[PDB]
């Protein structure tokens, strides 16, 4: 929904789960499950292999979702030296550097964390 998300083209999806090597026809429980695919690299995974809740799955499927390694901070659009400590929203899975949150964070939030776009 962000302007810079409506604007970056989407890479061709790979129709194989990077984690279990199944397709949309077979996840780890040998049942069909649609894949989610990274908009930048095209790699895909079952939501069940990504450990996404059903609610989070619905939301990321409607967004320009990025995999763990491709994730860029939604504020500064960078990864940078602090990329490994980038927070992932538990509602939309967007990434934010702690220093790029509104308000900026000095310490890691405890428990489930929802980003500045998602909180009412």
């Amino acid at each position: 929904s962000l302007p810079h998300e409506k604007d970056k083209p989407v890479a061709e999806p790979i129709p194989i789960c990077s984690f279990c090597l199944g397709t949309k026809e077979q996840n780890r429980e040998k049942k069909p499950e649609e894949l989610i695919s990274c908009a930048d690299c095209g790699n895909s995974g079952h939501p069940s292999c990504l450990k996404f809740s059903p609610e989070l799955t619905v939301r990321v499927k409607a967004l320009r979702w990025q995999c763990i390694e491709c994730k860029t901070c939604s504020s500064c659009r960078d990864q940078g030296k602090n990329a490994d400590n980038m927070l992932f929203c538990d509602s939309c899975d967007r990434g934010f550097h702690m220093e790029c949150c509104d308000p900026p964070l000095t310490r890691m939030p405890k428990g489930m964390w929802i980003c500045q776009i998602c909180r009412p």
């Binding site: 790979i14 194989i16 990077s18 984690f19 279990c20 090597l21 292999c49 990504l50 450990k51 763990i68 390694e69 994730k71 990329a83 490994d84 400590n85 980038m86 927070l87 992932f88 538990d90 990434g95 890691m108 939030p109 405890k110 428990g111 489930m112 964390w113």
Partner: peptide, 25 residues
Amino acid sequence: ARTKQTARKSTGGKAPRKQLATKAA
């Protein structure tokens, strides 16, 4: 909270790339 680092660990490792290639072939 979830970070890139902790998500990498909690999710579990990806399958071997060579096996992902023999699948896609």
